[PDB]
Symmetry: D2
Subunit: 330 residues, 4 copies
C-alpha cells in the first residue's frame, strides 16, 4: 500500500479524545453552535447526533469538507449515542421551537418527552461531561435535564440569559455609541417574557446609568430605557417573523459558554441554575443569575444585590417557572 | 440626555470604514460566508444585500445580536447598493443554486441575467473593490462579472477550485492519517464535473505520491486513487441530496480567500482567472489555476508543469466551459 | 530566472500597505509590543525603528524567521524614518527607562529631548497615523507628542493606566476566584505613583464591592484591599527589582489598545488624554480617564462619578503632573 | 468576608488542569515559548521553572499582569518541580546557550549534566507527559532526555529542524514573492551546521523547483540556491552576533509544535526522533525527519525519498551526532 510506502507507523495506541464536544440536534441552532465552536478551536473532536439520518450525514460531511480551514481533526455523527463517548461537553439543541404568538413555555410537554430519550443516552457515554441545555423553555429544560440525568447541579447548565444579556448590551451600545464589550448590564430570570433587566447594575466604566437618571427603566423615563428590555424580550419573535427562526446569535452565545467551560475561564455569565435559597425562593427553581463558569460547570453563584422592585420582578419570574415545573410528568 | 451626562463628545466623525466587506445574497452560502468572515475578524464593517427585504433584515439583526462575541463593530443591510459603498471586497453569492442531480452548468443563463443587474450596482458604489464570485457556474460567472464590470482581470476572482482542493486534501488526509494541512494536492480547471486532479504534484513532506505509485490516479492504479477525485466531483451532489444544499465548507473556503485578499498574504490558491495564453488555450476562458492572491487580487499565476494526461484533461475542461460561454449574450 | 519559469507576472507591483504599524524602539517593551501585535494579526506590515544598527537588524531578522507562523507578510526595519511611511498606527517605546528607586517622572528631560527628534520624523512619513505613546512619563509625553506633532488631540494617545487597570483586575480576580475579564475596576490619573483606584466603581456582575464592604480601599478594611492598589503602584518597581525591567504585560496592554484602534472597536480604556475642563482642572494636563477608542483615536471621554476622596486624589494626580509639565522647554 | 458576601460556593473542585504546559528555563528562549503559547490559547495552566529565584518570580509576575488580555487562567512558577504536576507537555529550554561564534555541540556536557537533575524531576511530577526538548544540541539532548526519562520514544521530541525549515521557507518566499505558507521545502538532520536541504522536495503548488532548474542547490546553479541553505545554517550565528541571542522565531516554532501536540492535529513537522532502521542507520541516533505529531507525540515517520547525495549528507549528519552521543557520561 501507498500509505506504508510513505509512512512508517511507530505507535499502535488507542486514540481517546481530550476536549470533545457533542452537539445534539442539527437544526439551524445546533449547526450555528457547531460552526461557532469549530471556528473558536474549542474542541479536538466534534460529534453530531440527530434522528434525521440524511440531514445528519449531510451536515457532518459539509463541516468535514471545511477541515483544511479548521483545527478540529475529527468530526463524526450518528443517530447512535455511542458516537458521543468521552465528551467533556454535551450541548442539547433538539426539540420543537415556538411559532409567532406562541410562548416558549408552550413547548414544555413536547420537549420533556424528547429529553426523556436524549438525556439518559447522552450521560451513559460521557462520565466527565457538563450538560449545556439550549432547547426551550431553557430554564425548565435545565431543571428537567438535571432531574433526568441525576447529575449534580454544577454540571447542568442552561444557555439561559447569556443571549438576552448580549442583546441588551448590543442595544445599550447602539444608544451610547460604545462597543457592547464596554457596556455592562444584566438581564436575569427566565429566558423569555418574564426576564428582568437589572437597571441598578447597568453601567459604562463603573458609572451607574441609574445614578445619572434615577427614573432609568421606569415609565417616567424620558428616554424610555424600558423599551431596550422590551426589544430584548421581543427579539426572538421579531427575528422569527423576519427570517423564520433565530440561529447566529444563539450559536455565538452557546460558543461563548463552551469557551468558559472548555478553557476553565471562570468568567461570569447569566445562565440557568438552581436558585433555591436566594431571594426568598424556597423551591427547586432554575433561572438565570450571574454564575462563575469553568471546567466543572457552575462552581459558584454571584449574589446580585437587587432593589426591592428588581427582586419582586425576579420572584415573579421564579413563581412563573415554578408553576410550569409543577406541570412536569416524569 | 443620559448619553451627554455620561460621555463628553470630542469628535463628531461618521468616518469611512477601512476594511469593509459586502456579501451579496443572504441564502445559506451567503450567510455561511458572512459568519465565517465575522469569526475570522477580517472586516470593520459587513454589509449584506438581497432582494427579499424581511429575510435580509432578520439575518442582519440575528448577526447584530451576537456583536458582544465579535470584533466587527458595524453590520448593515439593504436592498439598496448605497449600503455597499467603499467596500474593499464584494462577494457575490446570489442567484439560482445547484439542484439535486443537476449540473452547476444548468444555472448559467438565469445567473448571467441576475449579474446584469448586480454587477453595475456593485461597481457604482465601490469602483475600486475586488470582486469575489461564488455563484455557480463560478468560472463562467467570473468571466461574466469581468465583462460587465469593466474591471482589470486581477480584481475579478472566482472562488473556483479552492473548495475542490480543500475537499481533495481532506479525503487524502483521511486515507493517510495526516491533517489536510500537511497533505498537498491541486484540483484545477472547472469548479464542477470536468475538474482536473494534478496527480503529478500530489505529495506529503515533498514526497511525490506518484513516485511511490507510478499509476497514481489512473485506471491501472491498484489502489484506485481516481476514486478520491470522483468523491471531490460528486461531493456537492451528495451533500445536496442529503441536506438540500451546501454551505459550511464553501463559507470557510470563501473566508480563506477573503483572508488572503484583506491581509495581502500572497498565498497560492486554485481560483478562477483568465487562462488565455496558457496550455494552448486561445479564448477568454476563466478556470482555476494556482494564483498568488493578495490586496490587488490576482497578481501572478503559478505555471504548473502538467503531464500530457493532465494537460489533456485541463484542455477538455476549458473546451466544456467555452462551449457554454460562446452561446452567451449580454 | 527560476522565478519567471515558475510564476507568470500579471500585474505591476505598486505595493502600498493598508494596515501598517510601526514600533519605534526595540528594547524589551518595543519587542513585546511587536510580538503581541504580530500574534494578534493586527497589521499587514510591521516596521521597526531604532538608533542601534546591529540590535535593530537582529530583532527584525528574528521576527522575519517566524513569518511561516504569522499573518504579517512584511517585516522591515531601519534607523531611517522612510521605512515607517504610510503607517496607520505608530507606537513610541523609545527613551530612557527608570532605574530601581527612580520615578518615571525623572525621565522627562531625556525623553522630551528624544521626542523632539522622533515625533516630527514619524509625522513626516505617516500623516494619517494615530500616535500611541508608551515611553515614560507617558502622560507628560502624550502632551509633548501632541504639541510637537501638530496632530489633533484625538490622534495622540498615551498607553496610560490601561496596564495599571489590568494589574488591578488580575489582583482582584485572584482574591475572588473570578477571571479578570469579569472583575471590573478602574485605576485612573498618572501611570505612576499618584494613580487613583476608583473603589466606588469596583464590581463583579454590577455588584458594587464598596456597597458590600463600605471600608473597601481604606486603612480600616479588614481584608486590606488598599494593598491591591499599592501592589499596582509598586508593580513596575517590584518586577524591575526581580527581572531588571518589565515587558510582557505592557506589550499585551499596548496590543489591546492597538486592537481597539485598528479594528475601530470603540471599547472604553483608561488612557492618557487632555483632561482640562473636567474635575475643575484648568491646565493642559494629560492623564488617564476612561476613553472610547477607535479608528480616529480618542473620540469621547466617559465622565466618571467619583466620591469626594477619589476626586481629590485625581485632582492631586493632575497637580503632580502639572508641577513637572509647567517647567518643560521644547 | 467579601468573597463570601459576593459569591456562594457550590463545590470544592479537583483543580487538576486539563491542558497544562510547563516551560523549564526562563531565559530568552523559554520566555518567547511562554508568550507564544499564551497568545495561541494552548493551555489552561502555564507553569515556569528555573534556578534563579528572582528572575523566575519577575517573569511569572510580568505574564500574570497581562492575564486580562489572555485566556490562560493560571500562571505559576517555582524552583520546585511540584509546580509542574499533571502537565500534558513539558518544554525544556534550560541550560547553557551558544555565545557568539559558538557551536551548539560545544554545549553538550554542560547541558547533559543539567538534564541529569531536570529530567527525573519532570518525570516524577508528570509521568504521562510529552517531553519537548529545545535546549542545545537539541538532537543529542532529545536522546539524553529519552534515556533518563525511561519514556517510550513517541513521547520525547526535539524541536529539531522545525525552525530551520521555517527559515528556509521564509527565504524561499522572499525570493519568489510568495507567502512562506505556500513555499514548501524541508531541512533535515542535525539542527546545526550538518543540516540537509532536500532540494528534490522544494516546491510551490506541487511544481518542483529542481524540475525547472536541474542544477538547483549545486555549485553549477546560476541563481545559487545553495546560499539559501547556507543562510539557514548561519541564521542563529548571524542573529546572535546582532542581538546577543535568538528568541522570537524559536518561540514561534516551539508554539507551532505545542499546537500540533495539544490539539492532536497530526501535522507533519521536521523534528528530532530516533532514526534507527532508516537510511542505513543501525544506532540510537536522534535527528530531524518529517514526523506526524499529535496527542501521543510522534506516532509516525514520513520516509523521504532522498537522492544518493541527499542520503549521504543525512548519514554524514547522523555520523557527526552519534560520534558525541555514544560516549556521553550520565
Ligand atoms: C427523541 C429525539 N431525539 C432527537 C435528537 C435530535 C433532534 N433534532 C431536532 O429537534 C433539531 C431541530 N430542532 C431545533 N430546534 O433545531 C430531535 C430529536 S427527537
Ligand atoms: C436581481 C437580483 N439581485 C439579487 C440579490 C440577491 C439575491 N439572493 C439570492 O439569490 C440568495 C439565494 N441564492 C443563493 N444562491 O444562495 C437574489 C437576487 S436577484
Ligand atoms: C533620537 C533617538 N531616537 C531613538 C529611537 C529608538 C531608541 N531606542 C530605545 O530607547 C529603546 C530602548 N528603550 C526602552 N525604554 O525600551 C532610542 C532613540 S534616541
Ligand atoms: C540544574 C538546573 N536546572 C535548571 C533549570 C533552569 C535553568 N535556566 C536556564 O538555563 C535559563 C537560561 N538559559 C537558556 N538557555 O535560556 C537552569 C538550570 S540548571
Ligand atoms: C432548540 O431550538 C432553539 C433554542 C434556542 C433558540 C434561541 C431563541 C429562542 O429562545 O427562541 C432566541 O432567543 O433567539 C432558538 C432555537 O431554535 C431556533
Ligand atoms: C519605553 O519604556 C517603557 C515604557 C513603559 C513600560 C511599562 C512599565 C513602566 O511604566 O515602568 C510598567 O508599568 O510595567 C516600561 C518601559 O521600559 C521598561
Amino acid at each position: 500500500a501507498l500509505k506504508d510506502q510513505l509512512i512508517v507507523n511507530l505507535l499502535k495506541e488507542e486514540q481517546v479524545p481530550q476536549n470533545k464536544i457533542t452537539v445534539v440536534g442539527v437544526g439551524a441552532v445546533g449547526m450555528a453552535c457547531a460552526i461557532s465552536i469549530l471556528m473558536k478551536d474549542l474542541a479536538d473532536e466534534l460529534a453530531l447526533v440527530d434522528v434525521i439520518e440524511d440531514k445528519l450525514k449531510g451536515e457532518m460531511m459539509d463541516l468535514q469538507h471545511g477541515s483544511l480551514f479548521l483545527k478540529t481533526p475529527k468530526i463524526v455523527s450518528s443517530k447512535d449515542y455511542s458516537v458521543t463517548a468521552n465528551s467533556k461537553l454535551v450541548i442539547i439543541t433538539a426539540g420543537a421551537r415556538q411559532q409567532e404568538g406562541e410562548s416558549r413555555l408552550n413547548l414544555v410537554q413536547r420537549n420533556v418527552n424528547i429529553f426523556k430519550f436524549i438525556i439518559p443516552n447522552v450521560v451513559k457515554y460521557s462520565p466527565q461531561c457538563k450538560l449545556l441545555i439550549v432547547s426551550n423553555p431553557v430554564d425548565i429544560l435545565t431543571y428537567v435535564a438535571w432531574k433526568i440525568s441525576g447529575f449534580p447541579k454544577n454540571r447542568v447548565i442552561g444557555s439561559g440569559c447569556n443571549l438576552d444579556s448580549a442583546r441588551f448590551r448590543y442595544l445599550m451600545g447602539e444608544r451610547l455609541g460604545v462597543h457592547p464589550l464596554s457596556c455592562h448590564g444584566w438581564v436575569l430570570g427566565e429566558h423569555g417574557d418574564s426576564s428582568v433587566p437589572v437597571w441598578s447594575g447597568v453601567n459604562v466604566a463603573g458609572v451607574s446609568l441609574k445614578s445619572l437618571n434615577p427614573q432609568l427603566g421606569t415609565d417616567a423615563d424620558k428616554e424610555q430605557w424600558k423599551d431596550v428590555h422590551k426589544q430584548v424580550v421581543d427579539s426572538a419573535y421579531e427575528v422569527i417573523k423576519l427570517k423564520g427562526y433565530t440561529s447566529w446569535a444563539i450559536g455565538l452565545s452557546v460558543a461563548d459558554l463552551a469557551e468558559s467551560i472548555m478553557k476553565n475561564l471562570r468568567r461570569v455569565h447569566p445562565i440557568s441554575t438552581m436558585i433555591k435559597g436566594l431571594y426568598g425562593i424556597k423551591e427547586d427553581v432554575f433561572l438565570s443569575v450571574p454564575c462563575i463558569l469553568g471546567q466543572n460547570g457552575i462552581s459558584d453563584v454571584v449574589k446580585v444585590t437587587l432593589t426591592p422592585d428588581e427582586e419582586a420582578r425576579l420572584k415573579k419570574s421564579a413563581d412563573t417557572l415554578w408553576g410550569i415545573q409543577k406541570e412536569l410528568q416524569f
